[PDB]
Amino acid sequence: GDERFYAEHLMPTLQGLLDPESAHRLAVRFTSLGLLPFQDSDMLEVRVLGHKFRNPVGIAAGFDKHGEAVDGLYKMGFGFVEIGSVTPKPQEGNPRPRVFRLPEDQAVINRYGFNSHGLSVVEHRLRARQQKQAKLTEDGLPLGVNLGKNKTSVDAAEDYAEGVRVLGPLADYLVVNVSSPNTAGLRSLQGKAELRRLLTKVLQERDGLRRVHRPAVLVKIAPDLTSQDKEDIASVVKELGIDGLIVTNTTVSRPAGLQGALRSETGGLSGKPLRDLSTQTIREMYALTQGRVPIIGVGGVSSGQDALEKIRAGASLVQLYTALTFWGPPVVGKVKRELEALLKEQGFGGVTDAIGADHRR
Numbered sequence: 198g199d200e201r202f203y204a205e206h207l208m209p210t211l212q213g214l215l216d217p218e219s220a221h222r223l224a225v226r227f228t229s230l231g232l233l234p235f236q237d238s239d240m241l242e243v244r245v246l247g248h249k250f251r252n253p254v255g256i257a258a259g260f261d262k263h264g265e266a267v268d269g270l271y272k273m274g275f276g277f278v279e280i281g282s283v284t285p286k287p288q289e290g291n292p293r294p295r296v297f298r299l300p301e302d303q304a305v306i307n308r309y310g311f312n313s314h315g316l317s318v319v320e321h322r323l324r325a326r327q328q329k330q331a332k333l334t335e336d337g338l339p340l341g342v343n344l345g346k347n348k349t350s351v352d353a354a355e356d357y358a359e360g361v362r363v364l365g366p367l368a369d370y371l372v373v374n375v376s377s378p379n380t381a382g383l384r385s386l387q388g389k390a391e392l393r394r395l396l397t398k399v400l401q402e403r404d405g406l407r408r409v410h411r412p413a414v415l416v417k418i419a420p421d422l423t424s425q426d427k428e429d430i431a432s433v434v435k436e437l438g439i440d441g442l443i444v445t446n447t448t449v450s451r452p453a454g455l456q457g458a459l460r461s462e463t464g465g466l467s468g469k470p471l472r473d474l475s476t477q478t479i480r481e482m483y484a485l486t487q488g489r490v491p492i493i494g495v496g497g498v499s500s501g502q503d504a505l506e507k508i509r510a511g512a513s514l515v516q517l518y519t520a521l522t523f524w525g526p527p528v529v530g531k532v533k534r535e536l537e538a539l540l541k542e543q544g545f546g547g548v549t550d551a552i553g554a555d556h557r558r
């Protein structure tokens with residue numbers, strides 16, 4: 198579980214033996230079987246979204262789409278796990294190959310298209326460990342469930358509403374994912390009037406659940422939005438009392454300077470080239486919501502400095518996925534140790550004190 202050996206030997210060898218989707222499937226299997234080998238200091242604890250989070254570093258959606266590896270992800274050191282996206286009915290997603298690595302850029306491009314076991318399957322899987330999750334949550338290890346919509350659905354809002362009804366009772370927070378670049382028309386749900394109508398319905402459905410099964414609701418947004426789109430989102434989120442934002446999904450942009458041979462593949466780009474575009478989006482959303490709406494910052498986090506930049510820009514919590522595909526499991530403890538060292542070096546009493554700090558200088 199030594200960073201160097203994973204980084205220099207194990208991951209590169211793995212990457213030479215398997216295609217990227219196979220490597221992801223084996224990583225889920227391995228993690229879920231518990232074949233996995235940092236004690237979190239109090240400075241890392243954060244209280245938000247009606248929960249305690251023992252550390253602010255989560256696994257982003259997409260790695261565990263069907264809720265198979267939740268316990269092995271906490272064992273990896275993540276302070277919170279998000280599963281999904283999950284769609285109402287099962288569906289296979291796009292044809293393969295649909296995942297591409299850009300190792301010269303430390304980036305990935307994927308176009309899975311919401312391959313999902315569906316709500317019923319994920320529901321039974323989570324019910325089999327529901328009381329165990331209740332104790333993990335009370336111990337500072339919460340669970341998010343990210344909701345998507347089926348490719349051929351004719352009523353997007355009813356797909357999310359169904360997600361709320363079936364998985365909301367099993368989640369500490371739900372994510373209305375309206376930012377996949379890999380589902381036709383989906384990102385237009387981020388528009389003001391579509392968004393307000395969609396989220397009104399979601400929140401009415403969430404508020405209809407019994408109090409102990411009533412999750413926070415967050416909206417996950419793209420990094421590709423116009424300034425007008427961001428203003429409209431901020432306004433809707435404040436008008437409706439949305440509980441938080443997840444910022445950001447992958448980018449359909451292809452920044453100048455990408456070197457990987459596969460850079461012109463269709464799909465969302467994740468990893469280092471997305472990092473500052475995501476940080477800047479957090480920074481803007483935090484300012485437009487006056488610091489009053491929790492943000493989970495995600496996009497290109499691969500180190501403590503990456504995490505702290507997003508926290509100082511306005512994130513209460515961060516997630517990563519793509520870094521794990523290059524550095525393997527040791528990157529989790531790495532990010533937490535470096536983040537703790539930087540908070541001390543910069544004078545913060547803990548993560549809480551750093552949240553949004555760039556906006557107060």
Ligand SMILES: Cc1cc2nc3c(=O)[nH]c(=O)nc-3n(C[C@H](O)[C@H](O)[C@H](O)COP(=O)(O)O)c2cc1C
Binds near residue numbers: 259309374519
């Ligand atoms: C292979 C892959 C599949 C993904 N699937 C989803 C998904 O199902 N739902 C979602 O909201 N985000 C999904 N994401 C986006 C990640 O959750 C995250 O928003 C984005 O990758 C930026 O983080 P990163 O640079 O650390 O990977 C996926 C990302 C990747 C790499």
Ligand SMILES: COc1ccccc1-c1ccc(NC(=O)/C(C#N)=C(/C)O)c(Cl)c1
Binds near residue numbers: 217221521522526
């Ligand atoms: C439990 O995961 C690992 C444990 C030990 C060593 C390597 C891994 C591992 C191996 C592969 C992956 N995933 C990928 O390589 C990948 C790509 N490309 C994606 C899309 O998940 C991940 Cl997330 C982790």
Ligand SMILES: O=C(O)c1cc(=O)[nH]c(=O)[nH]1
Binds near residue numbers: 282307
């Ligand atoms: O294709 C997917 O399933 C998917 C990819 C991605 O990058 N983001 C997302 O929200 N869904």
